[PDB]
PDB file of C-alpha atoms in Angstrom:
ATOM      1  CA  UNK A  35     122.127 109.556 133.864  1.00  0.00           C
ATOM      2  CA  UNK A  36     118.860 110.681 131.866  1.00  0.00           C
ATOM      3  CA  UNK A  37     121.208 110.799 128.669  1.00  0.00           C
ATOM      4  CA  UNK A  38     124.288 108.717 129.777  1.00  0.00           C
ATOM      5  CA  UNK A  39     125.479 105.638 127.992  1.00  0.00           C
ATOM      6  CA  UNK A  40     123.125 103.130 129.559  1.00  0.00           C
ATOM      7  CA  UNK A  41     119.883 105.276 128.641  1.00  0.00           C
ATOM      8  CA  UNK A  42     120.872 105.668 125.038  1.00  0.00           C
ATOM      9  CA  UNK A  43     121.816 101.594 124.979  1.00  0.00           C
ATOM     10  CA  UNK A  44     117.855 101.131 126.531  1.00  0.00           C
ATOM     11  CA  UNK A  45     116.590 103.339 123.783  1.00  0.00           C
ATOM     12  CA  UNK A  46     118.944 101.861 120.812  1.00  0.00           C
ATOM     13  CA  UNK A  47     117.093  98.358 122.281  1.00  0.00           C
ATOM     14  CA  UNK A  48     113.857  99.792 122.084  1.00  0.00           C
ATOM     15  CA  UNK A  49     114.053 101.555 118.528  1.00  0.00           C
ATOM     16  CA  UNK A  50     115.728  98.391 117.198  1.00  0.00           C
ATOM     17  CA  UNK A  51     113.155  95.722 118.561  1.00  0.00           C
ATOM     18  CA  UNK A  52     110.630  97.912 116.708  1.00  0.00           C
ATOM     19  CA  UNK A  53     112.438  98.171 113.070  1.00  0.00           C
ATOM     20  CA  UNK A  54     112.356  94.141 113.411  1.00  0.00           C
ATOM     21  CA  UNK A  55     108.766  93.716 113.853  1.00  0.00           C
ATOM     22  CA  UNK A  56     107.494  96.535 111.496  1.00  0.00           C
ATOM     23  CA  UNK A  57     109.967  94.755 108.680  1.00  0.00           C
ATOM     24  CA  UNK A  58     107.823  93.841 105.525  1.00  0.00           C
ATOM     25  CA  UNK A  59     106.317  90.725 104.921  1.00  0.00           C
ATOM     26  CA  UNK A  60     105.735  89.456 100.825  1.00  0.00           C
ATOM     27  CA  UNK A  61     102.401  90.807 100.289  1.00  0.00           C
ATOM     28  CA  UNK A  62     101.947  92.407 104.053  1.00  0.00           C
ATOM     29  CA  UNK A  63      98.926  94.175 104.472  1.00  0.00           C
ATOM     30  CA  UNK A  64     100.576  96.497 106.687  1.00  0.00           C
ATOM     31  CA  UNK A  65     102.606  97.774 103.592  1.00  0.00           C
ATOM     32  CA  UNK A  66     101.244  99.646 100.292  1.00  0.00           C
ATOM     33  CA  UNK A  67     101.497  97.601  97.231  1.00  0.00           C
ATOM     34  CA  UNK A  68     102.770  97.789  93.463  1.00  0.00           C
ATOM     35  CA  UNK A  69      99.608  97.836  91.490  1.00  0.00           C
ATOM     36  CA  UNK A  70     101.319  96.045  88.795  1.00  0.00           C
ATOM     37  CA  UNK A  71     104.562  95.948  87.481  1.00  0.00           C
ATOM     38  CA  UNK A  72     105.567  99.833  87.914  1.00  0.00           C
ATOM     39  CA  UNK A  73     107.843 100.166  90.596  1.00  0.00           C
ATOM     40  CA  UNK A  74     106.544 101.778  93.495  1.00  0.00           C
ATOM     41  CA  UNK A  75     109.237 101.811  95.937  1.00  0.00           C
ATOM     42  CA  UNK A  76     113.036 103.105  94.841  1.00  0.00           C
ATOM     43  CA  UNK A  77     114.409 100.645  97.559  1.00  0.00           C
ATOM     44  CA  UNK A  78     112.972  97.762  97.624  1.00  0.00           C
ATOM     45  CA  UNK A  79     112.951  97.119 101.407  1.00  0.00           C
ATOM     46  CA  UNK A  80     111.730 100.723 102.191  1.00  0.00           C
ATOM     47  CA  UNK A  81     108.222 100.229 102.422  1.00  0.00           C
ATOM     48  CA  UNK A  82     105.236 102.774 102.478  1.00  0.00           C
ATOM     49  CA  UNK A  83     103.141 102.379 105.806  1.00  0.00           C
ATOM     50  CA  UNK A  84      99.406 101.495 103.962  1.00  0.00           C
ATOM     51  CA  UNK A  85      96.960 103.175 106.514  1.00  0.00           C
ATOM     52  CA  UNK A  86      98.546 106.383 106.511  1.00  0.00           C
ATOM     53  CA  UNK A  87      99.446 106.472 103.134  1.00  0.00           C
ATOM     54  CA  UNK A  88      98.880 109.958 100.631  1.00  0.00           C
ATOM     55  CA  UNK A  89      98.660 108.369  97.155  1.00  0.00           C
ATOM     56  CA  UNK A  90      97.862 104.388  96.534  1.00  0.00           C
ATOM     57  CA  UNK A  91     100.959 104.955  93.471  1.00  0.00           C
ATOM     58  CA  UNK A  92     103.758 106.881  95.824  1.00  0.00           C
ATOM     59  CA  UNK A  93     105.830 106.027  98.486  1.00  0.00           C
ATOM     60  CA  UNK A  94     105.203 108.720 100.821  1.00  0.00           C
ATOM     61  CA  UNK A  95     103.222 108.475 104.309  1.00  0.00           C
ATOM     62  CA  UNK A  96     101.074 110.986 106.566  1.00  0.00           C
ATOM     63  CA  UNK A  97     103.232 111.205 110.187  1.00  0.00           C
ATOM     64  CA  UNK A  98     102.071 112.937 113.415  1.00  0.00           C
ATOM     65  CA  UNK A  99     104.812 113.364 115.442  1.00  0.00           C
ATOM     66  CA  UNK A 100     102.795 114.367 119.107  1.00  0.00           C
ATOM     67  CA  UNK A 101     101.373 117.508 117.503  1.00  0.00           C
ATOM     68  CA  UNK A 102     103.635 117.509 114.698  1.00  0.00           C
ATOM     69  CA  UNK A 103     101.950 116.911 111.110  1.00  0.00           C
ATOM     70  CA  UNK A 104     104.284 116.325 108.335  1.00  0.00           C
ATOM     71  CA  UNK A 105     104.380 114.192 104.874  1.00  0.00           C
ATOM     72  CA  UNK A 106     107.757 112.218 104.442  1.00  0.00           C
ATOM     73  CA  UNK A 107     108.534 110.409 101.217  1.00  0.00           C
ATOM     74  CA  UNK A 108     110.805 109.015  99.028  1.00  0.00           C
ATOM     75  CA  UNK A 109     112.238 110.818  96.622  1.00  0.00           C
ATOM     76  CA  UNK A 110     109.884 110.439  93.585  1.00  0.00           C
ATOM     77  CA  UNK A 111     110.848 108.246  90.499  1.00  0.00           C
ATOM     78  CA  UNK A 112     110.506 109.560  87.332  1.00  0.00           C
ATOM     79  CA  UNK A 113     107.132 107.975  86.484  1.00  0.00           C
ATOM     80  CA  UNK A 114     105.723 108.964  89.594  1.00  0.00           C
ATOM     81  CA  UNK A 115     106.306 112.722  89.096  1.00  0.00           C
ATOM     82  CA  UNK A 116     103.163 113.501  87.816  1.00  0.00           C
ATOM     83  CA  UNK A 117     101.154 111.526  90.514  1.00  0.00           C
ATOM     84  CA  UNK A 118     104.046 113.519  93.415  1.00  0.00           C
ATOM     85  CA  UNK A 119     102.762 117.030  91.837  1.00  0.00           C
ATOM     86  CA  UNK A 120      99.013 116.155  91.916  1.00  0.00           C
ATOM     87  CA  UNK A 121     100.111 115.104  95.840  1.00  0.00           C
ATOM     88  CA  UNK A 122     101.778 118.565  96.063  1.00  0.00           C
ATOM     89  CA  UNK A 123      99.018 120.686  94.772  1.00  0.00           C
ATOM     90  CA  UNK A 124      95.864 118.777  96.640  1.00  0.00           C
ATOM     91  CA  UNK A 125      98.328 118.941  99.630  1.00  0.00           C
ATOM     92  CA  UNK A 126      98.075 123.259  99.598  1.00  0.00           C
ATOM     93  CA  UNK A 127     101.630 122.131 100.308  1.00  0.00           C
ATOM     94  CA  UNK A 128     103.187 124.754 102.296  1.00  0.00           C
ATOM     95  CA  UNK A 129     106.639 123.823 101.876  1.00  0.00           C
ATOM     96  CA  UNK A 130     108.333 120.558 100.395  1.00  0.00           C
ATOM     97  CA  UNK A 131     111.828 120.339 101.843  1.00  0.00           C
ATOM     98  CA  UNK A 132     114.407 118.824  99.612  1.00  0.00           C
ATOM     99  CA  UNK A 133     117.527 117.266 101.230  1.00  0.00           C
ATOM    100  CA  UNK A 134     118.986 114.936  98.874  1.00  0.00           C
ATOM    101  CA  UNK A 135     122.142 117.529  97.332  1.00  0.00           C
ATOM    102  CA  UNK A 136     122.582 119.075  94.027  1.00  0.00           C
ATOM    103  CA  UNK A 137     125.424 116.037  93.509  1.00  0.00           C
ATOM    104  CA  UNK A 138     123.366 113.191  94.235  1.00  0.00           C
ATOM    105  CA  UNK A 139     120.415 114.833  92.575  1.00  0.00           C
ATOM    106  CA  UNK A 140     122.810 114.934  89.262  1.00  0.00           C
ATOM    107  CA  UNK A 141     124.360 111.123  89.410  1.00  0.00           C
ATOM    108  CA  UNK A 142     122.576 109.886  86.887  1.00  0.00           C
ATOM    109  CA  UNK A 143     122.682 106.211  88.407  1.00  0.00           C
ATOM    110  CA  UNK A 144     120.543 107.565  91.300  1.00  0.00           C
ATOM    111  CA  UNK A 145     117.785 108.292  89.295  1.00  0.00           C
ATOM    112  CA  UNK A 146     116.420 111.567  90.832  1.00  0.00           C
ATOM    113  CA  UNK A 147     114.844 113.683  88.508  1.00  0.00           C
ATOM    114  CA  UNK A 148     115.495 117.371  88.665  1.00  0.00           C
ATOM    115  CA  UNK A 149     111.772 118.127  89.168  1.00  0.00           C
ATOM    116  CA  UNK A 150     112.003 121.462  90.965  1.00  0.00           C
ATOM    117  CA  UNK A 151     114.836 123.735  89.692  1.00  0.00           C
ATOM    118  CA  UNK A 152     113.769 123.490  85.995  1.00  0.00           C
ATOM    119  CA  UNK A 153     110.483 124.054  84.578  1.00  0.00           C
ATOM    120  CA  UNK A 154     108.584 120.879  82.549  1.00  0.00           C
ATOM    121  CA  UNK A 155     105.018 119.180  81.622  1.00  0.00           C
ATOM    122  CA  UNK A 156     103.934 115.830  82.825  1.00  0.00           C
ATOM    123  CA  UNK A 157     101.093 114.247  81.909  1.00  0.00           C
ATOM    124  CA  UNK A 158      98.785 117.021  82.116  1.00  0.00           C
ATOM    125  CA  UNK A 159     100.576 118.648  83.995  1.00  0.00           C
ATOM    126  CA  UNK A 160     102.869 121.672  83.703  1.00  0.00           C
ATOM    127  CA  UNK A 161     105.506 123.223  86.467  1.00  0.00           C
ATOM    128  CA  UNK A 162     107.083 126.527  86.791  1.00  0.00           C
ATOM    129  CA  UNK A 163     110.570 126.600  89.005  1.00  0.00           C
ATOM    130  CA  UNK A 164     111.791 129.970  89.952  1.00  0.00           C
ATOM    131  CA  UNK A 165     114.510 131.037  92.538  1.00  0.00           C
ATOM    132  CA  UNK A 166     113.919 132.759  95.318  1.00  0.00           C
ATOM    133  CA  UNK A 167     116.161 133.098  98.283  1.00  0.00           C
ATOM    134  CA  UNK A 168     119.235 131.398 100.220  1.00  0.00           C
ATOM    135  CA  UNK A 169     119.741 131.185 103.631  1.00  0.00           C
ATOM    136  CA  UNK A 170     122.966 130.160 104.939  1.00  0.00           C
ATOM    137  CA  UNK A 171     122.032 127.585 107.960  1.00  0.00           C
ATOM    138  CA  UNK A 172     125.325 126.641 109.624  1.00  0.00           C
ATOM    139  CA  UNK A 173     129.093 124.929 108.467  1.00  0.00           C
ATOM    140  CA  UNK A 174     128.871 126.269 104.906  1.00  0.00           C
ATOM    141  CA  UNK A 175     125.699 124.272 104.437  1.00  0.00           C
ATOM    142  CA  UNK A 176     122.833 126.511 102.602  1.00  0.00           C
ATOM    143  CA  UNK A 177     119.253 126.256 101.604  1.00  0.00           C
ATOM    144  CA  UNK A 178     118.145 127.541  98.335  1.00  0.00           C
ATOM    145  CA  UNK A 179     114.935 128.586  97.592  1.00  0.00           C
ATOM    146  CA  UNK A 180     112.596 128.281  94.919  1.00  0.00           C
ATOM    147  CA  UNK A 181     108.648 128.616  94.065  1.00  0.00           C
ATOM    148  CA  UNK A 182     106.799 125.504  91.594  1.00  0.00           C
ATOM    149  CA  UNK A 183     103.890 126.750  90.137  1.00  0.00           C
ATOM    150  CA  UNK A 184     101.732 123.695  89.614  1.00  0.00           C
ATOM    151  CA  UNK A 185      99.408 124.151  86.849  1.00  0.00           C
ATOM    152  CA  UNK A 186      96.942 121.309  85.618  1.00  0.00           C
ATOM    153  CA  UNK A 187      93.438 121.844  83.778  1.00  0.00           C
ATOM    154  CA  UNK A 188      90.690 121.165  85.727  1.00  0.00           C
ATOM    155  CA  UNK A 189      92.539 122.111  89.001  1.00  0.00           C
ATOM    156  CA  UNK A 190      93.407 125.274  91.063  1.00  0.00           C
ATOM    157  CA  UNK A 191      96.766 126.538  90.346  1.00  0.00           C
ATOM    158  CA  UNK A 192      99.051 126.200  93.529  1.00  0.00           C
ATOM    159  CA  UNK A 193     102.591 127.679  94.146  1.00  0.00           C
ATOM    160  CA  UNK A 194     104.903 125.566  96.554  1.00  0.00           C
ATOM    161  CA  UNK A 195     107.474 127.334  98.865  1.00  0.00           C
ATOM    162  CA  UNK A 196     110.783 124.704  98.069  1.00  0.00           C
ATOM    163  CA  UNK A 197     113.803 124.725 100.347  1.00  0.00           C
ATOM    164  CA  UNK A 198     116.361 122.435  98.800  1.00  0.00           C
ATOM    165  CA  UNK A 199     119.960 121.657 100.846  1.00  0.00           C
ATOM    166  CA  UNK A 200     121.980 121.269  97.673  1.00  0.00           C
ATOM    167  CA  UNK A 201     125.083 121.259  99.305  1.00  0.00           C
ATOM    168  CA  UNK A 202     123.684 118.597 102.240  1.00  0.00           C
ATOM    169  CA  UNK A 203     127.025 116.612 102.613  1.00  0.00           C
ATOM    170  CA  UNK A 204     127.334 113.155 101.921  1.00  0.00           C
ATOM    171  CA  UNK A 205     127.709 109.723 104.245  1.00  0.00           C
ATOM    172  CA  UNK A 206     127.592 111.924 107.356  1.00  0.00           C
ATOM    173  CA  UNK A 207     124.907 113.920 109.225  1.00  0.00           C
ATOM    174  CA  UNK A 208     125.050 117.476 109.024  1.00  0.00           C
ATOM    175  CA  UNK A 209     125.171 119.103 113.182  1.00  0.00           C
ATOM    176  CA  UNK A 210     122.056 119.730 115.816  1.00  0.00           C
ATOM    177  CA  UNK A 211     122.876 123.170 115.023  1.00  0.00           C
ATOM    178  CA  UNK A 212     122.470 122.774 111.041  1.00  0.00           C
ATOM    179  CA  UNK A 213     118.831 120.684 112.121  1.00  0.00           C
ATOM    180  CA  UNK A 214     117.503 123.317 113.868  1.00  0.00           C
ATOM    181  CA  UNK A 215     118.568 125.930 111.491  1.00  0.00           C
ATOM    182  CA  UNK A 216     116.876 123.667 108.858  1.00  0.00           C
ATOM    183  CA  UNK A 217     114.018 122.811 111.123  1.00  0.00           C
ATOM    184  CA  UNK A 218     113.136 126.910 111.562  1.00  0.00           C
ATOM    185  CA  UNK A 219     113.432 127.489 108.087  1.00  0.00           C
ATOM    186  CA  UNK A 220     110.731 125.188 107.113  1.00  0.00           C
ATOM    187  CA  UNK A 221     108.356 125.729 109.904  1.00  0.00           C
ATOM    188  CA  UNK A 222     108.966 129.761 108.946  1.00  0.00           C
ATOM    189  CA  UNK A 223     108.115 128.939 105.326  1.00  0.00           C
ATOM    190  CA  UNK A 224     105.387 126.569 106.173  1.00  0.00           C
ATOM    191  CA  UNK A 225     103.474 129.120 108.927  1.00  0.00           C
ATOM    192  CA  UNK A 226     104.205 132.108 105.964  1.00  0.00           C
ATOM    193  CA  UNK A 227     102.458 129.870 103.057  1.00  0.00           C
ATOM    194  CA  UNK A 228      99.760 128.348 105.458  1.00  0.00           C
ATOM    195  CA  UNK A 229      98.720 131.859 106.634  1.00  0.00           C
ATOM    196  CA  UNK A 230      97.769 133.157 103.038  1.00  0.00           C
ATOM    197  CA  UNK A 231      96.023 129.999 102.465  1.00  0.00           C
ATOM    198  CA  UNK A 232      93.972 131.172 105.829  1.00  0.00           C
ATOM    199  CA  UNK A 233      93.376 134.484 105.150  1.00  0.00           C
ATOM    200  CA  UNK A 234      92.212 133.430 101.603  1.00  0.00           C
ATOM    201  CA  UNK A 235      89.538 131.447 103.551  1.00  0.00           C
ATOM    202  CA  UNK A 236      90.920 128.103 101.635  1.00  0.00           C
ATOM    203  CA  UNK A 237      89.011 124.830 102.899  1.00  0.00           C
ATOM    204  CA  UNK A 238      92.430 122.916 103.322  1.00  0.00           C
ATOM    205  CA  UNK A 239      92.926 123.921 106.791  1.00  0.00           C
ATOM    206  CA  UNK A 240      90.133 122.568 108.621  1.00  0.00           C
ATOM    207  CA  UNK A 241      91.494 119.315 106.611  1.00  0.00           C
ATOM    208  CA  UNK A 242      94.547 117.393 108.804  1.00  0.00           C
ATOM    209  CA  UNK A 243      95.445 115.331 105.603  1.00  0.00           C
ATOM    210  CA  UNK A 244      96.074 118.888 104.058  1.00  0.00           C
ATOM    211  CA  UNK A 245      98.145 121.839 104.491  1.00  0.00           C
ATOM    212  CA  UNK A 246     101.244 119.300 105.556  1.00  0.00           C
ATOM    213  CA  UNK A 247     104.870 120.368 104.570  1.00  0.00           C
ATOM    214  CA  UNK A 248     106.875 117.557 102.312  1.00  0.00           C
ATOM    215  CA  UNK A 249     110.174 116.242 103.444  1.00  0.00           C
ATOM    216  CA  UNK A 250     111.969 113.895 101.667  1.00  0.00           C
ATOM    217  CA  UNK A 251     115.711 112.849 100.995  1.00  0.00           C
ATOM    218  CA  UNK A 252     116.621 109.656  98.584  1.00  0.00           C
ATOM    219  CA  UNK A 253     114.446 107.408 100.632  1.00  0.00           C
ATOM    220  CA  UNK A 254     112.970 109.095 102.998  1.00  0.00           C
ATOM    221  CA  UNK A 255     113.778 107.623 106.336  1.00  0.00           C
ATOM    222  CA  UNK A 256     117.101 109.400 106.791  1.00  0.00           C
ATOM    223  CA  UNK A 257     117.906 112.788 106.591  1.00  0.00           C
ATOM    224  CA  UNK A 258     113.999 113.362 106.427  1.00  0.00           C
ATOM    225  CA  UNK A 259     113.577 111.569 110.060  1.00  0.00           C
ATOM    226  CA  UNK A 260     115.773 113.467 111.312  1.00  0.00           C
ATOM    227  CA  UNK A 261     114.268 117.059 110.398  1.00  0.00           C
ATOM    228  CA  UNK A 262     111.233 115.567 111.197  1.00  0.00           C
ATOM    229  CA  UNK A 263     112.661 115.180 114.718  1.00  0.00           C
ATOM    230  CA  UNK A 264     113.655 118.436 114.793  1.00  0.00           C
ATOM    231  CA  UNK A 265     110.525 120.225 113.674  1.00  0.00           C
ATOM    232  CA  UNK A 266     108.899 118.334 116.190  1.00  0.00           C
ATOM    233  CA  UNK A 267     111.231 119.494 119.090  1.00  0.00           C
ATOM    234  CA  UNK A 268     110.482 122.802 117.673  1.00  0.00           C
ATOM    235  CA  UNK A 269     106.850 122.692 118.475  1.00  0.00           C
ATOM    236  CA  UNK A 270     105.789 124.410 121.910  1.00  0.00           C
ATOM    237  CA  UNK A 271     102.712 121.815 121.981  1.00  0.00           C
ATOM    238  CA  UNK A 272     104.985 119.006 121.948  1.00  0.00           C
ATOM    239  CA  UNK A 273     106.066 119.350 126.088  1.00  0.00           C
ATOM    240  CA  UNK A 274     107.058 115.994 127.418  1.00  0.00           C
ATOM    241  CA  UNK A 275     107.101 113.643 123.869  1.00  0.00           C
ATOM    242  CA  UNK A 276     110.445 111.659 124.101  1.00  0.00           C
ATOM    243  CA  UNK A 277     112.825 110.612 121.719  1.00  0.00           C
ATOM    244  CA  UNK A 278     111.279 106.934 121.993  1.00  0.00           C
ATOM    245  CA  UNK A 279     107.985 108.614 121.430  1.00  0.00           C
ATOM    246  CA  UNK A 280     108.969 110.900 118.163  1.00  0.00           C
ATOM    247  CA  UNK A 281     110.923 107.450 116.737  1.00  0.00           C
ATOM    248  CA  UNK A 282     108.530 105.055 117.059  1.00  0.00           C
ATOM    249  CA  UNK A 283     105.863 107.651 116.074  1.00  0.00           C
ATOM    250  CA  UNK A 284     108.267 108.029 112.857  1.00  0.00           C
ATOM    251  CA  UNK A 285     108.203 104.028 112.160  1.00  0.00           C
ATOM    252  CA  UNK A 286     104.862 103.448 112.902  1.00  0.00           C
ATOM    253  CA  UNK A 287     103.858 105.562 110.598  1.00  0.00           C
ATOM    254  CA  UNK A 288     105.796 105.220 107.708  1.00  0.00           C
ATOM    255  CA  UNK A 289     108.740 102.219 108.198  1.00  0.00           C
ATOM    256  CA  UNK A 290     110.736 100.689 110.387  1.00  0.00           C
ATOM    257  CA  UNK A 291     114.229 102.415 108.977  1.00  0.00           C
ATOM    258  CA  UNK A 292     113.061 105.887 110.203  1.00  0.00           C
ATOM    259  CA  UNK A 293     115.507 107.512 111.566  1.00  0.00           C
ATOM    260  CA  UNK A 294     118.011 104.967 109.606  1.00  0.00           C
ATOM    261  CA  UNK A 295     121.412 105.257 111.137  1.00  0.00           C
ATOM    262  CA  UNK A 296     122.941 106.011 114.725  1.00  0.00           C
ATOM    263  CA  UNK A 297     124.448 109.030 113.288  1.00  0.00           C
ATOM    264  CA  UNK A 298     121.182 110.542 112.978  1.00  0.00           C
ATOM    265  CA  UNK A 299     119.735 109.523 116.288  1.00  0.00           C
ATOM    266  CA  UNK A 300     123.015 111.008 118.116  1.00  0.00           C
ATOM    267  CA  UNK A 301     121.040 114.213 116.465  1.00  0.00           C
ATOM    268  CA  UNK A 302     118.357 113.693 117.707  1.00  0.00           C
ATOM    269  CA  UNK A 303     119.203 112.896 121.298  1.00  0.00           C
ATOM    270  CA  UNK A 304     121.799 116.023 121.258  1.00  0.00           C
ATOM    271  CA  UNK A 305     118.537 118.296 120.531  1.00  0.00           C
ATOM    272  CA  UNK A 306     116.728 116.559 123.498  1.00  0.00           C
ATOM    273  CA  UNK A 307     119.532 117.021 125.927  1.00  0.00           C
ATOM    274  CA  UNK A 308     119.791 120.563 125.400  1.00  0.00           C
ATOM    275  CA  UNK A 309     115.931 120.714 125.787  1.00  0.00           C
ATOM    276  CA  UNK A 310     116.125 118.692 129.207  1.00  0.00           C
ATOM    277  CA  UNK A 311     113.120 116.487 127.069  1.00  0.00           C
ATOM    278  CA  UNK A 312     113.184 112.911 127.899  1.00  0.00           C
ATOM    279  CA  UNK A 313     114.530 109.805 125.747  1.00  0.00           C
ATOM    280  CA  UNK A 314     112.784 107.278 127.454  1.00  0.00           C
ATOM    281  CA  UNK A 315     109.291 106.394 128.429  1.00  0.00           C
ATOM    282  CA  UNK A 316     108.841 105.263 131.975  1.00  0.00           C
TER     283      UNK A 316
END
């Protein structure tokens, strides 16, 4: 019953009652604004929640899922780059998770820049991209690694962990079992990066804006909600959040398209099931 048809209708009610009421307004001060006339969001109804917001020129939100602290954003347009990398470096970021594929990442008409697999300067600042490993994480799908060395005068040099899913198919969602592949490689990365930052003594982790790994896909309310849903279920603080919980969390927090298609909440609800964690608040 806890997961049969009716429960999952209740919760689809629930989740889409929400994404109604947390749709933008013109002008609504719930939402971050365009300064002026650079665009600021690469969709135009894919808005940046303003109170939790990381940068007043990127689309990209803080989100606490129960215990779970993360950064989700778009991915960043090519004027924003140099504003994303400041975001990465003040961040300590301990991994940024890429899911948008190598194909998309190429189609020109998407307008993704390559920003991590090839070395460049912007603005003042300059980026090093080398490769590191690959790990296979279910169904042919693999994660490539690299390191960006973020280098800017003024500022401490920081190296990002990257795991990019360049082969992340397209119009489908990849399995549970790919998520939580996914979801332990970037908590692994994140826990290996965070720890020298701790035994370095670093500042940024008695800081909860800081030390936060980066997800994003194309817009960041997609593949990115659900590995955000999965790190979460992979959290042993997290006892007892339910998928209503960890969704709403998502769209409070960010938008109301979190978690944007069906097909990605089946996901999530097939990673709750075999956790015997709820889907709906009582």
């Amino acid at each position: 019953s806890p997961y049969g048809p009716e429960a999952r209708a209740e919760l689809s009610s629930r989740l889409t009652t929400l994404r109604n009421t947390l749709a933008p307004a013109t002008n609504d001060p719930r939402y971050l604004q365009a300064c002026g006339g650079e665009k600021l969001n690469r969709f135009r109804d894919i808005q940046c929640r303003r109170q939790t917001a990381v940068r007043a020129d990127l689309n990209a939100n803080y989100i606490q899922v129960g215990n779970t602290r993360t950064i989700a954003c778009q991915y960043p347009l090519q004027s924003q780059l140099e504003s994303h990398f400041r975001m990465l470096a003040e961040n300590r970021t301990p991994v940024l998770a890429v899911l948008a594929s190598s194909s998309e990442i190429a189609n020109q008409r998407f307008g993704m820049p390559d920003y991590f697999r090839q070395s460049g300067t912007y603005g003042s600042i300059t980026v090093e991209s080398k490769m590191t490993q690959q790990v296979g994480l279910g169904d042919g799908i693999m994660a490539d690694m690299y390191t960006l060395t973020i280098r800017e005068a003024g500022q401490k040099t920081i190296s990002v962990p990257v795991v990019h899913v360049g082969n992340y198919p397209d119009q489908t969602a990849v399995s549970s079992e790919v998520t939580k592949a996914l979801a332990s490689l970037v908590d692994q990365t994140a826990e290996t990066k965070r720890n020298m930052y701790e035994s370095k003594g670093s500042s940024a982790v008695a800081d909860d804006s800081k030390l936060r790994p980066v997800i994003h896909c194309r817009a960041g309310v997609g593949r990115t909600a659900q590995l955000i849903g999965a790190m979460c279920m992979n959290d042993s603080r997290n006892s007892q959040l339910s998928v209503e919980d960890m969704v709403s969390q998502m769209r409070v927090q960010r938008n109301g398209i979190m978690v944007q298609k069906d097909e990605q909440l089946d996901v999530l609800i097939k990673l709750a099931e075999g956790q015997g964690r709820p889907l709906l608040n009582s």
